[PDB]
Amino acid sequence: SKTIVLSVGEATRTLTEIQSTADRQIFEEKVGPLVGRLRLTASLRQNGAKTAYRVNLKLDQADVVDCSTSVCGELPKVRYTQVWSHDVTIVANSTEASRKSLYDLTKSLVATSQVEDLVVNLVPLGR
Amino acid sequence: SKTIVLSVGEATRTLTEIQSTADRQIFEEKVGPLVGRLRLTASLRQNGAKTAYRVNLKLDQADVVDCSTSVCGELPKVRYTQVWSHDVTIVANSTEASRKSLYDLTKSLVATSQVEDLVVNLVPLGR
Amino acid sequence: SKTIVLSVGEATRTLTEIQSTADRQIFEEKVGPLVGRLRLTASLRQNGAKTAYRVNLKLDQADVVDCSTSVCGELPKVRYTQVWSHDVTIVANSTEASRKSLYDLTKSLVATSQVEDLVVNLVPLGR
Amino acid sequence: SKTIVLSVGEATRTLTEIQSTADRQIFEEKVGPLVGRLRLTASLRQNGAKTAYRVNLKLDQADVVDCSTSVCGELPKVRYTQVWSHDVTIVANSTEASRKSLYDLTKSLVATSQVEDLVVNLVPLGR
Amino acid sequence: SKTIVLSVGEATRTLTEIQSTADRQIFEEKVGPLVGRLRLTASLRQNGAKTAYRVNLKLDQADVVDCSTSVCGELPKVRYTQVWSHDVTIVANSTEASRKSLYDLTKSLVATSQVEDLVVNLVPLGR
Amino acid sequence: SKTIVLSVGEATRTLTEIQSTADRQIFEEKVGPLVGRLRLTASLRQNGAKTAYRVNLKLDQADVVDCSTSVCGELPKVRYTQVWSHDVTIVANSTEASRKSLYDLTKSLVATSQVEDLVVNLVPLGR
């Protein structure tokens, strides 16, 4: 299979390849309950007349709840569902330096504190 | 207005707010030629019956070419166009710790070397 | 690739992964002649409407014979074929303690002397 | 009748023969509530034209729940059902040493820690 | 992934595994432009009633052309396409010495000067 | 007629032209028994509307067995058959340097130790 190690700061999470296919790669996190966990869908294809390409990356994670600790009968039930898809449209005949600069800019925008505030406090991006 | 500073590694790019509106925020990068540059579209809304929300983030950048350096007449013409949209469906009554963990996982997946290889070498994600 | 070590008592056998696929994992034992050896087929899937799961495990081993030691001319020919399939239907929302107890009971029933007699002497299980 | 003693580590469970028949042997565990307990189905037959044989072994155990301890009225109700069947296709004219080696290999694969992890953590077998 | 190093005499080319699948392995050479490069397709299967096997090996390489050095606008365009497929039908119960002798004969026929002349000067093989 | 000398390392084999024809050249090895020996089929043609060409090269060798050394009476009988065909699709208006580089790369891939292991041990190519 295929293992992916993610560092959150104090613990390390492990995602395992489940559904190995070319047009659809499904990675699932193995921690405890398999239902309602962390899943990742990856897809790669072409477009038009062999011009550019298309990459899709989605990450889902549904929270679960359980009442067997106090209530005398309740199966683990999912609550909400979060969907975070992507879309990469990069042509083949491009530039390695330009692609590296774009990746660095995306990494900086992700690691900046403005997107974190936009996600947490729901405040529009504008600092 | 609203300025956004992005660090690519050796230089700093500046994006300026251009179309300040609630349902559509348009940021445009100011470097030289305004046509065919870096643009960012942000949108925030609700859904259904005041249950969750919907956030959309798109980033476009079209390359330009010019022949006035050698050829004696050619206006700056755009070449290809890249579209990278997003979709955030996070409910209000959620969990701050869960949202922070999801953001950290997304940042780790973005900063990992697998997505960079998938973007550059067009190799399906699976290491 | 993926290696599996099995201890028979005095020697150790090694099975190697050959056909790495999600819906069908084929492990083959590497000792000498690849044709007519030990093979293992593993499969994992879902069922109905995301309720439970389905696991299938089959183990085959066909004996071979050869006459090149005495007779002039005879290629290694397979004789009989043995099929030992399985079927695991365990729901996701279950109990870890119950699953561990069931696995321990299955291990005890396998390691008991009654199933060995049923296999060897073909005597019905009932001691 | 016919009693079977199984050692779990700290306690001993007793299974009693209930439905004594040649083509179908039904063993049932006697602990408390007979409904929703441990049952075992054994079957032995032939195949084709008196060539080989066919042995089937299934083990079922359904969990039960009750609310009479707190709620003032609820009969013991079954929850989920687990099915673990088998299939033995061993020809008569075989080899005692080969059968013993196969049984030892099966016992080792059952007692190994990989199948336990595959059962508990639902991680595919591959260490 | 999987890297393959090929020595042409003065430089070394590197082919990288792209599409890892059992029934179809796609290797792609990484030098510059990914479109119109060196690709290799490998396939392995069985035949009939588990008698022999079937191996297919194809190698493609399409030349590209570009006019951006002089003409002020022309994307890299492919020209011709070359297809060199193979077919290996070797039974399992064969002979290692015979297979080695056949491989040595094939290597000698490939390295001989007659096939090179047949490829270059298009002269029928017959020296 | 047309003789081809192949060096295996310690001995030299001689193949003789037998069926001299334009659309089908059949070379046969002359050592002893003509039936069940080494044969080579060569074919050259065009394609479409005078664009490129098509070259086909197949090499067959069937092993033989005989029992007249011990058994009273048994004619030389063929056992298995091996087929190794080729396909060359090279356009006329190409490049001599590119063709030479491709031939050198093919010779290196043939003489490498990875294809030898793939042929002998039946291990997929990937070192």
From Swiss-Prot, chains A, B, C, D, E, F:
The protein's matches in Pfam families, at most eight in alphabetical order, are given as: Phage_coat
The record's annotation in InterPro entries points to: Phage_PP7_CP, Phage_RNA-type_capsid
Q: What is the effect of changing residue 54 to E/F/H/L/T?
A: Loss of translational repressor activity
Q: Which UniProt keywords apply?
A: Capsid protein, Disulfide bond, RNA-binding, T=3 icosahedral capsid protein, Translation regulation, Virion
Please provide, alphabetically and separated by semicolons, the GO molecular function terms listed in this UniProt record: identical protein binding; RNA binding
Protein origin, superkingdom: Viruses
Task: Detail which positions bind RNA.
Answer: 39, 45, 52, 54, 58, 60, 83, 85, 89
Q: What is the effect of changing residue 52 to L/P?
A: Loss of translational repressor activity
- List GO BP terms, alphabetically: regulation of translation
Where mainly found?
virion
Subcellular location, in the record's words? Virion
The keyword Cytoplasm belongs to this UniProt entry's keyword annotation: no
Instruction: Locate the coiled-coil region(s) and give their ranges.
Output: none
GO annotation, cellular component aspect = T=3 icosahedral viral capsid
Subunit structure comment from the entry: Homodimer. The dimers in the capsid are covalently linked with disulfide bridges. The homodimers binds to the viral RNA via an operator hairpin, but also to many other RNA sequences in the viral genome; this interaction probably shifts the virus from the replicative to the assembly phase and ensures specific encapsidation of the viral genome.
Family membership noted in the UniProt record: Belongs to the Leviviricetes capsid protein family.
Its biological purpose is as follows: Capsid protein self-assembles to form an icosahedral capsid with a T=3 symmetry, about 26 nm in diameter, and consisting of 89 capsid proteins dimers (178 capsid proteins). Involved in viral genome encapsidation through the interaction between a capsid protein dimer and the multiple packaging signals present in the RNA genome. Acts as a translational repressor of viral replicase synthesis late in infection. This latter function is the result of capsid protein interaction with an RNA hairpin which contains the replicase ribosome-binding site.
Q: What is the protein name for this chain?
A: Capsid protein
Species of provenance: Pseudomonas phage PP7 (Bacteriophage PP7)
